[PDB]
Design an enzyme around this catalytic site. Sequence first.
Site, PDB file in Angstrom:
ATOM      1  N   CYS A 130       0.800  -1.195   0.000  1.00  0.00           N
ATOM      2  CA  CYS A 130       0.000   0.000   0.000  1.00  0.00           C
ATOM      3  C   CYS A 130       0.816   1.219   0.000  1.00  0.00           C
ATOM      4  O   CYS A 130       1.911   1.218   0.550  1.00  0.00           O
ATOM      5  CB  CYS A 130      -1.022  -0.015   1.148  1.00  0.00           C
ATOM      6  SG  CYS A 130      -2.237   1.308   0.967  1.00  0.00           S
ATOM      7  N   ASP A 185       0.306   3.725   1.627  1.00  0.00           N
ATOM      8  CA  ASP A 185       0.234   4.214   2.994  1.00  0.00           C
ATOM      9  C   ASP A 185       1.574   4.596   3.601  1.00  0.00           C
ATOM     10  O   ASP A 185       2.513   3.854   3.503  1.00  0.00           O
ATOM     11  CB  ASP A 185      -0.398   3.123   3.841  1.00  0.00           C
ATOM     12  CG  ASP A 185      -0.854   3.608   5.168  1.00  0.00           C
ATOM     13  OD1 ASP A 185      -0.020   3.830   6.022  1.00  0.00           O
ATOM     14  OD2 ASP A 185      -2.050   3.761   5.368  1.00  0.00           O
ATOM     15  N   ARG A 230       2.737   4.575   6.590  1.00  0.00           N
ATOM     16  CA  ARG A 230       3.243   3.811   7.724  1.00  0.00           C
ATOM     17  C   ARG A 230       3.765   2.470   7.298  1.00  0.00           C
ATOM     18  O   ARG A 230       4.051   1.667   8.157  1.00  0.00           O
ATOM     19  CB  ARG A 230       2.145   3.627   8.803  1.00  0.00           C
ATOM     20  CG  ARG A 230       1.485   4.967   9.198  1.00  0.00           C
ATOM     21  CD  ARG A 230       0.112   4.814   9.750  1.00  0.00           C
ATOM     22  NE  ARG A 230      -0.824   4.118   8.866  1.00  0.00           N
ATOM     23  CZ  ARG A 230      -2.121   3.969   9.142  1.00  0.00           C
ATOM     24  NH1 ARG A 230      -2.618   4.443  10.287  1.00  0.00           N
ATOM     25  NH2 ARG A 230      -2.934   3.335   8.299  1.00  0.00           N
ATOM     26  N   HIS A 287      -2.582  -4.209   4.932  1.00  0.00           N
ATOM     27  CA  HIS A 287      -2.358  -3.700   6.271  1.00  0.00           C
ATOM     28  C   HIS A 287      -3.642  -3.202   7.038  1.00  0.00           C
ATOM     29  O   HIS A 287      -4.559  -2.615   6.441  1.00  0.00           O
ATOM     30  CB  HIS A 287      -1.309  -2.589   6.177  1.00  0.00           C
ATOM     31  CG  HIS A 287      -1.860  -1.299   5.662  1.00  0.00           C
ATOM     32  ND1 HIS A 287      -2.329  -0.301   6.495  1.00  0.00           N
ATOM     33  CD2 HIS A 287      -2.055  -0.853   4.398  1.00  0.00           C
ATOM     34  CE1 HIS A 287      -2.736   0.723   5.774  1.00  0.00           C
ATOM     35  NE2 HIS A 287      -2.588   0.411   4.495  1.00  0.00           N
ATOM     36  N   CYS A 335      -6.228   0.324   6.744  1.00  0.00           N
ATOM     37  CA  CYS A 335      -6.024   0.777   5.371  1.00  0.00           C
ATOM     38  C   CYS A 335      -7.212   1.635   4.884  1.00  0.00           C
ATOM     39  O   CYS A 335      -8.345   1.160   4.802  1.00  0.00           O
ATOM     40  CB  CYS A 335      -5.789  -0.456   4.496  1.00  0.00           C
ATOM     41  SG  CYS A 335      -5.688  -0.017   2.711  1.00  0.00           S
TER      42      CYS A 335
END
Lengths: 222, 222, 222, 222
Positions: free
Chosen positions: B42, B44, B46, B98, B101
């Site tokens: 992802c 994302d 993190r 994750h 998400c």
Amino acid sequence: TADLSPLLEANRKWADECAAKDSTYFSKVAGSQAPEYLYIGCADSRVSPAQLFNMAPGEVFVQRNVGNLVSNKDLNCMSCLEYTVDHLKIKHILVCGHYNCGACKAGLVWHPKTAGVTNLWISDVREVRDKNAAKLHGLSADDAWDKMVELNVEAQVFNVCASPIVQAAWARGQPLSVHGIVYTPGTGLVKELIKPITGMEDAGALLRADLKQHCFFSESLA
Amino acid sequence: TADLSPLLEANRKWADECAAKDSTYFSKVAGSQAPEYLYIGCADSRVSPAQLFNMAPGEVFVQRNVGNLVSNKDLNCMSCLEYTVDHLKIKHILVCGHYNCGACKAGLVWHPKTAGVTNLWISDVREVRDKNAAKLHGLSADDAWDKMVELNVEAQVFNVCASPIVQAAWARGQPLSVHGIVYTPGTGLVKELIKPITGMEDAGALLRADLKQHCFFSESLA
Amino acid sequence: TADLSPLLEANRKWADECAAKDSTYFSKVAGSQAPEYLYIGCADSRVSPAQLFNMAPGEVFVQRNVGNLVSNKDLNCMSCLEYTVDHLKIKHILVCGHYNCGACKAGLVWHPKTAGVTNLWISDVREVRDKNAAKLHGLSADDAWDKMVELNVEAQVFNVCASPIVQAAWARGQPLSVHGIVYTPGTGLVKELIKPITGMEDAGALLRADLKQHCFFSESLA
Amino acid sequence: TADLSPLLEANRKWADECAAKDSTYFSKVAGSQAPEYLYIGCADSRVSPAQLFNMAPGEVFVQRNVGNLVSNKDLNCMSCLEYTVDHLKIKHILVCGHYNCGACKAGLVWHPKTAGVTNLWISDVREVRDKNAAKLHGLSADDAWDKMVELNVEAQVFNVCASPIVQAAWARGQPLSVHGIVYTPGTGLVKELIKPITGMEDAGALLRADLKQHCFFSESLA
Ligand SMILES: [Zn+2]
Ligand SMILES: [Zn+2]
Ligand SMILES: [Zn+2]
Ligand SMILES: [Zn+2]
């Protein structure tokens, strides 16, 4: 033989070390993210933004693709752009190329006839190449490669700036800057190629193609 | 105003530390790469595969998009797959989702009328959700968010195995394993959600949906 | 309320008339097709290749999109091209634009900030326009609209010739010609804007941009 | 040998005949279009909407692609949808499949490993097939083909209805209906497969997948 154990053990070791050094390293980002950066860069295994800027989780939202390409018609890349600019309200966009980039080499040397999807995909690189052919004529292979990397960083910086997502953000006075950087895999070092662009005024100064002409072409018609 | 100096100081300080530790850390990958992993996860902020698996430059080739989605008709993801399997000859594909998400949340709640490109982009998550109505209806919004994550990971693993690229690699006896893993931003740990898949037999055992019927459908006719 | 009856009456009446004239008009194409033309033109409701060339069922395989655009990275157009050249073995590709085309107007005037998918879609027309600034700046909005049409047709013909599909067909000595034509909705006539192209030599003569350099770029290096 | 003369002469003859029958046939649409229909259908050379419904220029805006596929992530098809619904304000959308459709056959019999873009592109057909596998098991080749055509017409009708463009249009009370039709190439005849859909109420009645569940899935969460 195909076994994930070394990697899970490695993740284990990594997570403890970070949790020891600081108790809230992970838990502080358990239920949201507020990154200040979107990074757009190459999928190349030598170029890891979180690692190369030494960032902690939650700091940089990442798109990575072959050639670090930005196009209004790739919904993969555009959705990284729209979600970060519109929903997360990131403040800075890093467009990162690197030397020794295989896509940029393929963009110089492959014949369009080549089969498969990578060859479709790097059409954007051939289009930057052809537009800048005079800058590449009679350079040595390695020299033209290096120049292609840098030309591609500049084109993509341009496409970020010209994108509907960015043009719209700037038009409602949202602060957003765009940065052209390049990475040397053999040294681990980043170099700023294009100084910060914060709106149209800056782009007129720093970009070789004319963003204003691109956005307001009809003002030139009679 | 939007200066990059602190990022550049941090990069230089990092590059320095690494080469002082091991003097060929960078130089050994100056002129090529030979990663063994392709990682699909992802966008994302993190979730950095390089740092959560503690890998060095040259080990993991990375695709990152909104919701870690794999589709035959996304040239962006597909060229990462083609180039790493057909040119770099990688050995392992990690498909990583994750918890927490945003893309899997949106796929649960947004109304298809919603404007913009992220909404188009996440249609794949709606399709996984619709197929799996009976596992999600009536859970709390929170339990269903976590369930969506896992279902998506499983769907994407199936997409990797069913892709033209992985299918052709397998049929010519190239070794290639596919892995489903999920990551917890709150703890920094990775669980293996689906055990290694190395070909058509493993896939029959390990995946709910039927890859053999998918690939050889005309056999169930007359 | 929104009944289809009048369309169905009109279809039945039409099918009847045609088969009364020639009794195998339909039945001879009941079980296969062998068109000789692929036609790529505009989704515009005033431009039906079948009826303006007076062709019967089974003669022209048709792609129609907004602005008759051909790009390597549009699977929709590309599969029409691949399937007709590689499976049906067509002989002629007609790339047809038209005066009064809304897509070429939008490409001249819309601001890149404009919301929605048509704006993303028409980025190719902006790119043709930008490359051709010197031919468009200072014309009346109306003369420039007509000029955009022609330039686009020429650009798309180049895209057809430069595509992996046409390039591979040519290199294996499959006969294949490409044609640029433009249509006038106000008069129902078609002018041939670019003369037949049957391979690399014709292309050198007939197109402003350089297809040989595009395909064999690494030769202009050292 | 590659010579457009028969076609231009044919267009010539066609344009006179129509201009004789009626003096304003062409000139009345010289500078705009106000079609009431968007047609989405297969690129197949046997299926020409303007010809098969016997329409005059300006009546039907057309998308044609291999398999008559509709997807939120194909900007080619979505831009036909957005421009016609939002800018031209068409009133009716025809989704047309046909028997003997090569895409639907390829969707049944091809192995995913097959190279090239058409195989990427028809992934949507394999996805309709797999969802409906129980309806196709143990039918004869020709029987499953015919069923695949009809199943595909219904899925695509569903995707038109579920599209952001249509959902949005309906939500602001714009009148818009969606029609599922099928064409027999061997007879020239159209058959209505799905009765008119004019909003959510109709779709609940006529579609086998649940549009309401698709649009309001989160109402089912606790
Ligand atoms: Zn690269
Ligand atoms: Zn995510
Ligand atoms: Zn047009
Ligand atoms: Zn068909």
